[PDB]
Amino acid sequence: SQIPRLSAINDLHKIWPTVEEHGAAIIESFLSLDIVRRLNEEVDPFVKIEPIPAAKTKDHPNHILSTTTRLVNVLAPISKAYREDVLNSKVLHRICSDAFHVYGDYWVLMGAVMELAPSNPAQPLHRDMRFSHPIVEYLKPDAPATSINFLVALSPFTAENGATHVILGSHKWQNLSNVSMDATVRALMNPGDALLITDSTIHCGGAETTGTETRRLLTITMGISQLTPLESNLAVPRPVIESLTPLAQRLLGWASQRSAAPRDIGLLTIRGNSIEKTMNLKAEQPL
Amino acid sequence: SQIPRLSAINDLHKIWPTVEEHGAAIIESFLSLDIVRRLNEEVDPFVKIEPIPAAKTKDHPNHILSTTTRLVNVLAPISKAYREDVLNSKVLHRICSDAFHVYGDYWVLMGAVMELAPSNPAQPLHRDMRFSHPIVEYLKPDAPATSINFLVALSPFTAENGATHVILGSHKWQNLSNVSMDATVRALMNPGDALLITDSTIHCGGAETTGTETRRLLTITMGISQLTPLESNLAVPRPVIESLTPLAQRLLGWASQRSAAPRDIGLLTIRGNSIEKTMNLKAEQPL
Ligand SMILES: CN1C(=O)c2ccccc2NC(=O)/C1=C/c1ccccc1
Ligand SMILES: CN1C(=O)c2ccccc2NC(=O)/C1=C/c1ccccc1
Ligand SMILES: [Br-]
Ligand SMILES: [Br-]
Ligand SMILES: [Br-]
Ligand SMILES: [Br-]
Ligand code: NI
Ligand code: NI
């Protein structure tokens, strides 16, 4: 059976329950084609200048991504569409509050544009977070997902051009002896569609077989505010931060965070006061 | 049997193994009396002006600490002794690298001075982190400690003035039906001595019974860089940050972090590069 397909607006309340059951769901029209176009246009040059993932120039090289792959993260200062439209997505926030209510506040662990070159091979079948957060491997098998990944198509996803593989139900697997490409189904998607998986869903980028098509995706890893993001917004100019909504500011770590603990004492606080109150951080100040 | 006592220098290699076994150890002369004096002098006025933990002025009130208790965190900008001597402690870093090698890099989840007033009651027997990090309750019972707490005496700890209670072995308890003050032993300490416990050690602040003595402690919660600190250093002036060692900068979250994953892709990175490389962050620049 195939990855369940849900409408971003009509089926909103069904999205997280579907992922909790099956470990995957396709959100049709997660982003409008307008947002997809502006995002592609804004990140285009940064993709072109990005060195290889394991460049000797980098002090945090990525030795896992294929050398032909390009990843651009810290999108807030690059993309108006990302920092305004994506970070304030009603669909994303409903899904995240549904997913993470047991833990408390959530934020962006990483928002990255990934461009896969022609003839890019399939990734090995994997769970995310194993190269950054060893702690998640020590969680009880029954523990609610501490992170989820929105794999948004910025170009068409086909079986030919290397659409994502997922094993439905694999987010509940403890025994991994039945892990095989034979057990996978494909995430066929138009630009603006999003494949939503958990940190436990076994999946992989597909093989590019046309030899001509460049595939591009926006991967948004949303995680509980108790987990450290893969990316930092510390160097993002304060003027850009002060142009955002308070919600967007929290997602970039430019605000204090709260746990779901009845008498929560909070995260990233300053002597009982928030970052935003302390620093007198303004919001929605146009550039 | 009593809390094991170890010399900060002669017994350095024994400190973490002792805590892993017994859930507690007293580090004799963790800080020199010189450092204790300078720390007390530098934080003195900030303790006096600090409102009640649950002050209506605060947007992150602490509803758990007794109203007479005073907690001052984000000590880097207050205290030269803290930011230079404590953050670069050879003993602290050996213990933390011993404790957290399985996870990777560690940093300060919170460094706070706590002053307990005369007639302060004993805290309820508890494990730390339950009002900030619900995630730790979902870790497997056998999981290595993801945070440890250095309870440094800034004044004498006596049975009379409310010295810490610990239950030895309680860090390995799953069944909590034998939890009682009857099962506790006391951390009797001179200023500069430190009681080291894990996030699973069952313990409590003791009752102040003299009715005259003010008790003061420096609580340093050290945790894996994968967990979000209780406190933020985002508002600490860049000049103060650039006066620190690179190690101290990492502990305050003003640097990228690494996991122990063989092909680690890192935490708080910027397109494959560190915070410190990206922002051209200087170190050991005297004010
Ligand atoms: C290494 N790696 C990434 O870089 C990555 C990239 C974008 C978003 C999340 C992310 N995290 C991962 O766990 C990851 C998995 C992965 C596994 C196998 C093959 C290629 C990737
Ligand atoms: C609430 N609370 C704190 O505020 C606190 C203070 C300093 C350092 C860590 C810390 N974290 C806690 O878990 C904590 C425990 C706690 C429990 C029972 C009674 C009083 C405290
Ligand atoms: Br790849
Ligand atoms: Br993919
Ligand atoms: Br208290
Ligand atoms: Br105490
Ligand atoms: Ni993946
Ligand atoms: Ni405690």
Swiss-Prot record, chains A, B:
Q: Which GO terms describe its molecular function?
A: dioxygenase activity; metal ion binding
Q: Please name the GO terms of the biological process aspect recorded for this protein, alphabetically.
A: biosynthetic process
* Residues bound to Fe cation: 126, 128, 203
Coiled coil location: none
Q: What reaction gets catalysed by this protein? A: (-)-4'-methoxycyclopeptine + 2-oxoglutarate + O2 = (Z)-4'-methoxydehydrocyclopeptine + succinate + CO2 + H2O; (Z)-4'-methoxydehydrocyclopeptine + 2-oxoglutarate + O2 = (-)-4'-methoxycyclopenine + succinate + CO2; (-)-cyclopeptine + 2-oxoglutarate + O2 = (Z)-dehydrocyclopeptine + succinate + CO2 + H2O; (Z)-dehydrocyclopeptine + 2-oxoglutarate + O2 = (-)-cyclopenine + succinate + CO2
Enumerate the cofactors the protein uses. Answer: Fe cation
The UniProt keywords, alphabetically, are:
Dioxygenase, Iron, Metal-binding, Oxidoreductase
Q: Which branch of life, at top level?
A: Eukaryota
Give, as one word, the top-level EC class.
Answer: oxidoreductase
The enzyme's E.C. designation: 1.14.11.81
What pathway or pathways are given for this protein in its record? Secondary metabolite biosynthesis; Alkaloid biosynthesis; Mycotoxin biosynthesis
**Family that this chain belongs to:** Belongs to the PhyH family.
Oligomeric and partner information: Homodimer.
The role this protein plays is: Iron/alpha-ketoglutarate-dependent dioxygenase; part of the gene cluster that mediates the biosynthesis of the aspoquinolone mycotoxins. Within the pathway, the iron/alpha-ketoglutarate-dependent dioxygenase asqJ acts as a (-)-cyclopenine synthase that converts 4'-methoxycyclopeptin into 4'-methoxydehydrocyclopeptin through dehydrogenation to form a double bond between C-alpha and C-beta of the O-methyltyrosine side chain.
State the protein's name: Iron/alpha-ketoglutarate-dependent dioxygenase asqJ
Q: List the source organism.
A: Emericella nidulans (strain FGSC A4 / ATCC 38163 / CBS 112.46 / NRRL 194 / M139) (Aspergillus nidulans)
Organismal lineage:
Eukaryota, Fungi, Dikarya, Ascomycota, Pezizomycotina
